[PDB]
Design a protein around this nucleic acid. Structure first.
Ligand SMILES: [Cl-]
Ligand SMILES: [Cl-]
Ligand SMILES: [Cl-]
Ligand SMILES: [Cl-]
Ligand SMILES: [Cl-]
Ligand SMILES: [Cl-]
Ligand SMILES: [Cl-]
Ligand SMILES: [Mg+2]
Ligand SMILES: [Mg+2]
Ligand SMILES: [Mg+2]
Ligand SMILES: [Mg+2]
Ligand SMILES: [Mg+2]
Ligand SMILES: [Mg+2]
Ligand SMILES: [Mg+2]
Ligand SMILES: [Mg+2]
Ligand SMILES: [Mg+2]
Ligand SMILES: [Mg+2]
Ligand code: NA
Ligand code: NA
Ligand code: NA
Ligand code: NA
Ligand code: NA
Ligand code: NA
Ligand code: NA
Ligand code: NA
Ligand code: NA
Ligand SMILES: [Sr+2]
Ligand SMILES: [Sr+2]
Ligand SMILES: [Sr+2]
Ligand SMILES: [Sr+2]
Ligand SMILES: [Sr+2]
Ligand SMILES: [Sr+2]
Ligand SMILES: [Sr+2]
Ligand SMILES: [Sr+2]
Ligand SMILES: [Sr+2]
Lengths: 150, 142, 142
RNA sequence: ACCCUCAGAAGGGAGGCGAAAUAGAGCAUGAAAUCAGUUGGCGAUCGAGCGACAGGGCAUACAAGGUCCCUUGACGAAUGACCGAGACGCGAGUCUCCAGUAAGACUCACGGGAAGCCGAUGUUCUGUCGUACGUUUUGAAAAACGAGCCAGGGAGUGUGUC
RNA sequence: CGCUCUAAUUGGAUGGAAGCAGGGGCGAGAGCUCCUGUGGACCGAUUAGUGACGAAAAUCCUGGCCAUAGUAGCAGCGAUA
């Protein structure tokens, strides 16, 4: 697995991690990118609105074939990755939790750092025609989060 | 308070008018990189020099812009070849007994990396006392 | 709109290519040139063949495009571009600092460059750029 | 271990052990391809063997390199004048003298200056040259053949006789 | 020039070896060497030997990895649930 790629002062910070999560890595990059800079509470309200389908996540790198969404500002293609968003909500539940236990105002804290890393693949195999089989793998993702005091 | 180097760091050698001219020439003329043809085009092809062997090779054929091929005409002057940019001839030292016979007016010393801090301390003081500069000195807190 | 020209050239009764060659040389030397009265600029030869060449340039083209100007405004501007390396940085700066005009938008009368004037009393076989444009199908607005 | 979180023997956070947990379980070291985040340089008007050599911009903790710029002055190869005086030419221009003079690369000396400053490194811009590599072939950028990328592996050896 | 192991002669290392990463210096060059970080136990030099000794290529071998792509498929069958 990963370790925190950025330094964090324990006195003014809260940490959180997700390990070997079987969800789309491509969706995770997009979510991380969008929630960075936002307040922990803003991020929760945002991701819940994505799950509901009222807010699209901008797909800037992994956008091939993706249809344009009007609510996406400054860009064109976006989607509503609910599985990966639900996993990010668990990351923000853990962070705000760890934050409150330390005496901080968890919800009001800024997302200083959030990044997803492809930690591996859970391998699978799918039988194809002509007596041959090809890969049918699941991405295993890790994601780090550093909540900072405003 | 601050960091300072052990030994005679500022020491310069006494070179003849000719050896000083040739050193300044080597420094001015320089030489090309002499890296392998198309090393930059493929990650598996290292920078290390190999003679372009291909019958059609643009570098082998001497096509302008494809890089200089290694020839003897690129050699540095005999009188100065191998000298440190300071002008000193290097002597690789491993212990205190290796500092013997060294002329600190013309030769400087370079302690092997493998040598530990304890033995380095003894070499560095015995080098300063013998009037020899150490090219890789220890930086102590003064 | 205002264009701070260093040199204002009068194209009236002057051989287009000769003016263009000099206006190019000056633009690369850092001058801000402005060609004036290009409707009255001249190009020597048999009218019937001159028009054929220019009409062919208008008929040439495909999906990629071959935009050829019909107005004397643009024809002179394209002639100047052919004497400049407009694709390079230095050449584009030179071209963009040159502007051709219909008539004279300034107060100052332009200067007639050396070797560019054509003596109408000695020549019968020539055409005016405006005459070329009228034949090409351009709207006479001069 | 304990505590907090969680649907939770999960995972996470805090904490404990140890010289070391970036020694925490396929757990010594931990390269390249390559991925996430981020820094520097370039960037939505512009052209493609991706560079070599020159020269500019911007960028740089130390260490392992310490040079570099400008006035002036000395030296000064090949080359080599302007102006002027006289003399030719229809003319563009030329000859003689001034003069192998002034100049002339490098190097050095005095005085003054720079320490992101000189080198060097990253990137980018300009100039010049430039259609990979290896093989096949008279002729390969080739619309001839081979390779997605990287790492490691991968081809004159033994005996006998001459 | 470089690689392995042998031998003689002679050195270095827990006051930090090899390796690796980034960086400095030398050599026309094969390559040598130093600094910083990492690592945490081995490593050289000279001389004479030894050879399962040097790769960009062989539709080369094995492993790993990227783009392809969040794309094709998860509809088609007289059993449309
Ligand atoms: Cl993926
Ligand atoms: Cl030689
Ligand atoms: Cl067209
Ligand atoms: Cl051009
Ligand atoms: Cl006529
Ligand atoms: Cl010299
Ligand atoms: Cl052989
Ligand atoms: Mg689509
Ligand atoms: Mg079968
Ligand atoms: Mg390479
Ligand atoms: Mg390990
Ligand atoms: Mg043939
Ligand atoms: Mg010996
Ligand atoms: Mg090998
Ligand atoms: Mg080969
Ligand atoms: Mg497609
Ligand atoms: Mg039915
Ligand atoms: Na939009
Ligand atoms: Na919008
Ligand atoms: Na003409
Ligand atoms: Na046209
Ligand atoms: Na540069
Ligand atoms: Na072949
Ligand atoms: Na070829
Ligand atoms: Na061809
Ligand atoms: Na493949
Ligand atoms: Sr894309
Ligand atoms: Sr060392
Ligand atoms: Sr801990
Ligand atoms: Sr002279
Ligand atoms: Sr790394
Ligand atoms: Sr071999
Ligand atoms: Sr294996
Ligand atoms: Sr894949
Ligand atoms: Sr169905």
């Amino acid at each position: 697995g990963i370790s925190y790629s950025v330094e964090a002062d324990p006195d003014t910070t809260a940490k959180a991690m997700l390990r070997e999560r079987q969800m789309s890595f491509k969706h995770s990059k997009a979510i991380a990118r969008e929630i960075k800079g936002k307040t922990a509470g803003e991020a929760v309200d945002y991701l819940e609105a994505v799950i509901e389908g009222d807010q699209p996540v901008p797909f800037k790198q992994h956008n091939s074939g993706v249809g344009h969404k009007s609510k996406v500002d400054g860009w064109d293609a976006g989607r509503y990755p609910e599985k990966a968003s639900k996993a990010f909500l668990d990351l923000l539940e853990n962070a705000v939790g760890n934050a409150d236990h330390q005496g901080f105002d968890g919800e009001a804290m800024t997302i200083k750092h959030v990044a997803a890393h492809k930690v591996g693949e859970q391998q699978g195999r799918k039988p194809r025609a002509m007596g041959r089989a090809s890969a049918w793998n699941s991405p295993q993702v890790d994601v780090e989060l550093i909540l900072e005091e405003p | 308070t601050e960091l300072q180097a052990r030994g005679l760091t500022e020491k310069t050698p006494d070179l003849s008018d000719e050896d000083a001219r040739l050193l300044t020439q080597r420094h001015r003329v320089g030489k090309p990189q002499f890296n392998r043809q198309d090393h930059h085009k493929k990650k598996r092809v290292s920078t290390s020099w190999r003679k372009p062997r291909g019958q059609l090779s643009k570098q082998r054929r001497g096509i302008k812009g494809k890089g200089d091929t290694v020839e003897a005409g690129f050699r540095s002057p005999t009188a100065v070849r191998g000298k440190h940019p300071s002008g000193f001839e290097e002597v690789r030292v491993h212990n205190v007994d290796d500092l013997e016979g060294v002329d600190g007016d013309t030769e400087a010393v370079r302690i092997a990396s493998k040598v530990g801090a304890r033995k380095r301390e003894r070499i560095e003081e015995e080098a300063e006392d013998a009037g020899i500069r150490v090219l890789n000195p220890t930086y102590v807190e003064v | 709109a205002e264009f701070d020209a260093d040199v204002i050239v009068d194209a009236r009764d002057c051989i287009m290519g000769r003016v263009a060659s000099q206006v190019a040389e000056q633009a690369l030397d850092g001058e801000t040139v402005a060609v004036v009265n290009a409707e009255r600029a001249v190009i020597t030869g048999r009218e019937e063949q001159i028009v054929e060449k220019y009409e062919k340039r208008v008929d040439i083209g495909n999906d990629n495009g071959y935009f050829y100007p019909k107005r004397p405004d643009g024809i002179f501007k394209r002639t100047i571009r052919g004497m400049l390396p407009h694709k390079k940085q230095r050449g584009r700066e030179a071209f963009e600092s040159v502007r051709v005009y219909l008539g004279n938008p300034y107060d100052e009368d332009g200067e007639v460059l050396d070797g560019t004037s054509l003596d109408r009393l000695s020549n019968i076989k020539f055409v005016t750029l405006g005459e070329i444009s009228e034949t090409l199908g351009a709207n006479k607005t001069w």
